[PDB]
Design a protein around this motif. Sequence first.
Motif, PDB file in Angstrom:
ATOM      1  N   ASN A 138      -0.669  47.653  -1.305  1.00  0.00           N
ATOM      2  CA  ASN A 138       0.351  48.322  -0.511  1.00  0.00           C
ATOM      3  C   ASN A 138       0.981  49.405  -1.375  1.00  0.00           C
ATOM      4  OD1 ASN A 138       2.365  49.140   1.257  1.00  0.00           O
ATOM      5  ND2 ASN A 138       3.689  47.384   0.823  1.00  0.00           N
ATOM      6  N   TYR A 139       0.928  50.650  -0.897  1.00  0.00           N
ATOM      7  CA  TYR A 139       1.445  51.796  -1.635  1.00  0.00           C
ATOM      8  C   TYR A 139       2.605  52.475  -0.920  1.00  0.00           C
ATOM      9  CZ  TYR A 139      -3.164  50.928  -3.541  1.00  0.00           C
ATOM     10  OH  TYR A 139      -4.276  50.320  -4.069  1.00  0.00           O
TER      11      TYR A 139
ATOM     12  N   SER B  74     -16.608  58.853   4.071  1.00  0.00           N
ATOM     13  CA  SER B  74     -16.896  57.836   5.069  1.00  0.00           C
ATOM     14  C   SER B  74     -16.327  56.516   4.577  1.00  0.00           C
ATOM     15  CB  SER B  74     -18.403  57.708   5.338  1.00  0.00           C
ATOM     16  OG  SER B  74     -19.105  57.320   4.171  1.00  0.00           O
ATOM     17  N   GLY B  75     -15.745  55.750   5.496  1.00  0.00           N
ATOM     18  CA  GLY B  75     -15.109  54.500   5.145  1.00  0.00           C
ATOM     19  C   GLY B  75     -13.671  54.610   4.692  1.00  0.00           C
ATOM     20  N   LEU B  76     -13.057  55.786   4.808  1.00  0.00           N
ATOM     21  CA  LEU B  76     -11.666  55.988   4.439  1.00  0.00           C
ATOM     22  C   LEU B  76     -10.908  56.617   5.598  1.00  0.00           C
ATOM     23  CD1 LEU B  76     -11.494  57.318   0.743  1.00  0.00           C
ATOM     24  CD2 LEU B  76     -10.725  55.115   1.631  1.00  0.00           C
ATOM     25  N   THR B  77      -9.621  56.296   5.685  1.00  0.00           N
ATOM     26  CA  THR B  77      -8.708  57.033   6.557  1.00  0.00           C
ATOM     27  C   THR B  77      -8.374  58.331   5.829  1.00  0.00           C
ATOM     28  OG1 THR B  77      -7.863  54.985   7.508  1.00  0.00           O
ATOM     29  CG2 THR B  77      -6.544  56.973   7.820  1.00  0.00           C
ATOM     30  N   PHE B  78      -9.170  59.365   6.111  1.00  0.00           N
ATOM     31  CA  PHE B  78      -9.112  60.599   5.333  1.00  0.00           C
ATOM     32  C   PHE B  78      -7.746  61.263   5.435  1.00  0.00           C
ATOM     33  CE2 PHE B  78      -9.718  65.179   4.835  1.00  0.00           C
ATOM     34  CZ  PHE B  78     -10.395  65.244   3.634  1.00  0.00           C
ATOM     35  N   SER B  79      -7.108  61.181   6.605  1.00  0.00           N
ATOM     36  CA  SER B  79      -5.849  61.878   6.835  1.00  0.00           C
ATOM     37  C   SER B  79      -4.691  61.326   6.009  1.00  0.00           C
ATOM     38  CB  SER B  79      -5.493  61.826   8.320  1.00  0.00           C
ATOM     39  OG  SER B  79      -5.421  60.489   8.781  1.00  0.00           O
ATOM     40  N   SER B  80      -4.864  60.194   5.334  1.00  0.00           N
ATOM     41  CA  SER B  80      -3.825  59.627   4.482  1.00  0.00           C
ATOM     42  C   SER B  80      -4.325  59.444   3.052  1.00  0.00           C
ATOM     43  CB  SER B  80      -3.308  58.309   5.055  1.00  0.00           C
ATOM     44  OG  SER B  80      -4.352  57.361   5.174  1.00  0.00           O
ATOM     45  N   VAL B  81      -5.105  60.407   2.562  1.00  0.00           N
ATOM     46  CA  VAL B  81      -5.695  60.343   1.230  1.00  0.00           C
ATOM     47  C   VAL B  81      -5.600  61.718   0.582  1.00  0.00           C
ATOM     48  CG1 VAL B  81      -7.876  60.236  -0.021  1.00  0.00           C
ATOM     49  CG2 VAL B  81      -7.231  58.371   1.513  1.00  0.00           C
ATOM     50  N   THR B  82      -5.007  61.769  -0.608  1.00  0.00           N
ATOM     51  CA  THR B  82      -5.009  62.987  -1.407  1.00  0.00           C
ATOM     52  C   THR B  82      -6.393  63.201  -2.007  1.00  0.00           C
ATOM     53  OG1 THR B  82      -2.650  62.876  -1.925  1.00  0.00           O
ATOM     54  CG2 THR B  82      -4.069  64.066  -3.473  1.00  0.00           C
ATOM     55  N   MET B  83      -6.932  64.409  -1.853  1.00  0.00           N
ATOM     56  CA  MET B  83      -8.275  64.714  -2.327  1.00  0.00           C
ATOM     57  C   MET B  83      -8.211  65.648  -3.525  1.00  0.00           C
ATOM     58  SD  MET B  83     -10.325  63.000  -0.340  1.00  0.00           S
ATOM     59  CE  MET B  83     -11.853  63.761  -0.882  1.00  0.00           C
ATOM     60  N   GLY B  84      -9.200  65.535  -4.407  1.00  0.00           N
ATOM     61  CA  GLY B  84      -9.216  66.340  -5.612  1.00  0.00           C
ATOM     62  C   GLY B  84     -10.615  66.755  -6.015  1.00  0.00           C
ATOM     63  N   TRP B  85     -10.656  67.765  -6.876  1.00  0.00           N
ATOM     64  CA  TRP B  85     -11.866  68.288  -7.486  1.00  0.00           C
ATOM     65  C   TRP B  85     -11.655  68.314  -8.991  1.00  0.00           C
ATOM     66  CZ3 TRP B  85     -16.186  69.017  -4.713  1.00  0.00           C
ATOM     67  CH2 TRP B  85     -16.070  69.239  -3.334  1.00  0.00           C
ATOM     68  N   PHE B  86     -12.595  67.723  -9.723  1.00  0.00           N
ATOM     69  CA  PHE B  86     -12.666  67.772 -11.175  1.00  0.00           C
ATOM     70  C   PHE B  86     -13.991  68.404 -11.582  1.00  0.00           C
ATOM     71  CE2 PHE B  86      -9.058  65.048 -12.494  1.00  0.00           C
ATOM     72  CZ  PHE B  86      -8.684  64.567 -11.259  1.00  0.00           C
TER      73      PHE B  86
ATOM     74  N   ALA C  19     -13.178  63.765  -5.634  1.00  0.00           N
ATOM     75  CA  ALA C  19     -12.496  62.509  -5.906  1.00  0.00           C
ATOM     76  C   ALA C  19     -11.419  62.269  -4.857  1.00  0.00           C
ATOM     77  CB  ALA C  19     -11.872  62.498  -7.306  1.00  0.00           C
ATOM     78  N   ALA C  20     -11.096  60.998  -4.641  1.00  0.00           N
ATOM     79  CA  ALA C  20     -10.137  60.618  -3.615  1.00  0.00           C
ATOM     80  C   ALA C  20      -9.213  59.535  -4.146  1.00  0.00           C
ATOM     81  CB  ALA C  20     -10.841  60.119  -2.347  1.00  0.00           C
ATOM     82  N   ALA C  21      -7.926  59.664  -3.839  1.00  0.00           N
ATOM     83  CA  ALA C  21      -6.963  58.609  -4.126  1.00  0.00           C
ATOM     84  C   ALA C  21      -7.035  57.566  -3.010  1.00  0.00           C
ATOM     85  CB  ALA C  21      -5.566  59.200  -4.299  1.00  0.00           C
ATOM     86  N   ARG C  22      -6.155  56.572  -3.048  1.00  0.00           N
ATOM     87  CA  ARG C  22      -6.245  55.463  -2.110  1.00  0.00           C
ATOM     88  C   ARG C  22      -5.421  55.729  -0.850  1.00  0.00           C
ATOM     89  NH1 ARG C  22      -5.222  51.288  -6.995  1.00  0.00           N
ATOM     90  NH2 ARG C  22      -3.974  53.139  -7.493  1.00  0.00           N
ATOM     91  N   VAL C  23      -5.757  54.998   0.214  1.00  0.00           N
ATOM     92  CA  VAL C  23      -5.155  55.233   1.524  1.00  0.00           C
ATOM     93  C   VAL C  23      -3.656  54.978   1.453  1.00  0.00           C
ATOM     94  CG1 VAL C  23      -5.013  54.375   3.879  1.00  0.00           C
ATOM     95  CG2 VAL C  23      -7.248  54.819   2.842  1.00  0.00           C
ATOM     96  N   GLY C  24      -2.869  56.006   1.761  1.00  0.00           N
ATOM     97  CA  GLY C  24      -1.427  55.896   1.752  1.00  0.00           C
ATOM     98  C   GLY C  24      -0.776  56.043   0.395  1.00  0.00           C
ATOM     99  N   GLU C  25      -1.555  56.202  -0.670  1.00  0.00           N
ATOM    100  CA  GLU C  25      -1.004  56.260  -2.016  1.00  0.00           C
ATOM    101  C   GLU C  25      -0.400  57.629  -2.294  1.00  0.00           C
ATOM    102  OE1 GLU C  25      -3.839  55.505  -5.105  1.00  0.00           O
ATOM    103  OE2 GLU C  25      -2.290  54.953  -6.562  1.00  0.00           O
ATOM    104  N   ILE C  26       0.823  57.631  -2.813  1.00  0.00           N
ATOM    105  CA  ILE C  26       1.493  58.839  -3.281  1.00  0.00           C
ATOM    106  C   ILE C  26       1.323  58.884  -4.795  1.00  0.00           C
ATOM    107  CG2 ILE C  26       3.649  60.143  -3.351  1.00  0.00           C
ATOM    108  CD1 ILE C  26       2.352  59.615  -0.525  1.00  0.00           C
ATOM    109  N   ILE C  27       0.466  59.780  -5.282  1.00  0.00           N
ATOM    110  CA  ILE C  27       0.248  59.944  -6.717  1.00  0.00           C
ATOM    111  C   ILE C  27       1.062  61.137  -7.199  1.00  0.00           C
ATOM    112  CG2 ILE C  27      -1.986  58.796  -6.859  1.00  0.00           C
ATOM    113  CD1 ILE C  27      -3.254  61.636  -6.707  1.00  0.00           C
ATOM    114  N   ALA C  28       1.838  60.928  -8.264  1.00  0.00           N
ATOM    115  CA  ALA C  28       2.739  61.966  -8.750  1.00  0.00           C
ATOM    116  C   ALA C  28       1.990  63.038  -9.532  1.00  0.00           C
ATOM    117  CB  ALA C  28       3.839  61.342  -9.614  1.00  0.00           C
ATOM    118  N   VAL C  29       1.107  62.626 -10.436  1.00  0.00           N
ATOM    119  CA  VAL C  29       0.418  63.532 -11.348  1.00  0.00           C
ATOM    120  C   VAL C  29      -0.987  63.773 -10.807  1.00  0.00           C
ATOM    121  CG1 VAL C  29      -0.301  63.939 -13.721  1.00  0.00           C
ATOM    122  CG2 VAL C  29       1.799  62.655 -13.251  1.00  0.00           C
TER     123      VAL C  29
END
Lengths: 194, 127
Positions: free
Chosen positions: A115-116, B25-37, B97-107
């Motif tokens: 849960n986030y 695929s397999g993620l709720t994309f609209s609630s995921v921060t996306m990135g490129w490294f 790269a993708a963060a987790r569903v609903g996760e707010i990542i600061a950095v």
Amino acid sequence: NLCPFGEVFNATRFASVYAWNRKRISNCVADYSFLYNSASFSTFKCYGVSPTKLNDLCFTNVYADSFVIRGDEVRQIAPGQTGKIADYNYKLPDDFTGCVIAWNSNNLDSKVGGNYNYLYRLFRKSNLKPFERDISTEIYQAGSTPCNGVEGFNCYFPLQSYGFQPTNGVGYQPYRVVVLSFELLHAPATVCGP
Amino acid sequence: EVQLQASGGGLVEAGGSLRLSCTTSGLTFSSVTMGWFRQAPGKEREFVAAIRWKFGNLGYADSVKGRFTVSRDNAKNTVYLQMNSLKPEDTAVYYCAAARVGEIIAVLISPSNYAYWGQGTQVTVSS
Ligand SMILES: *[C@@H]1O[C@H](CO)[C@@H](O[C@@H]2O[C@H](CO)[C@@H](O)[C@H](O)[C@H]2NC(C)=O)[C@H](O)[C@H]1NC(C)=O
Ligand SMILES: [Cl-]
Ligand SMILES: [Cl-]
Ligand SMILES: [Cl-]
């Protein structure tokens, strides 16, 4: 007639610590026996009053603040403490009069996969004043170069999700906190015990 | 069962441009921060760009600011990286790269804030 502590302690949803919730309690009878007849609370301490005598006390108003943090941070909910939570999220004054109550909420606030939804403020330019609430979402400029609305190196978003997994260590598990503030005014007391 | 599939890339000359895409695929994309490294041969993986899901901010490495543009189409579960004015020092393997569903990542620049990683796409810029 009786104070609505159930809406505070037994609420199904709790606020994030950066956007901590406050409920004013007045013109009612306060029965704190639920704090004694319960082996579920992990922290129950008071400042300026004796915790076993709460039913003998009267106040003009009572303010209940509630939020979620992780176990390792409950110790920061005290006057004079330091750390991310005490400095950037929720700070008590040195002359605090009231009680701090906390309990493990892993069964309600943790989820398989995590849960986030609970957030905390990770960066800030200065410490909060006592009882100050900061819900801004400005990009934090860590260095000397302006960010111009774009994040990157030394340009961070100020909030951060807690990661509450059911298998987390008890120090990393979510805890629900209630802080009772007792206020005295040149007015009749409206919150007394039985 | 979460999968990231990238398209685009390849070989260009200095001054050219490319467009990378990444579909989940397999993620709720609209609630995921996306990135490129990206990672150059022998060097360490470095941050390129990122786009948030809730607070709308964009993030860019200083070396690609003004030349690269990150965007997203939620209806197509896709994140895009437009790479203009390419330099030879942009040659690397690029990772979505993708963060987790609903996760707010600061950095945004921290790789440890992303849980799902694509397979990588070669981008070469010669002379
Ligand atoms: C929150 O809810 C719990 C459970 O619904 C309450 O605890 C009960 O209190 C009554 C007192 O009238 C006891 O008879 C029950 O045995 C208690 N149940 C359990 C499971 O302990 C609790 O009082 C509520 N808290 C507040 C502040 O109202
Ligand atoms: Cl955490
Ligand atoms: Cl976000
Ligand atoms: Cl990839």
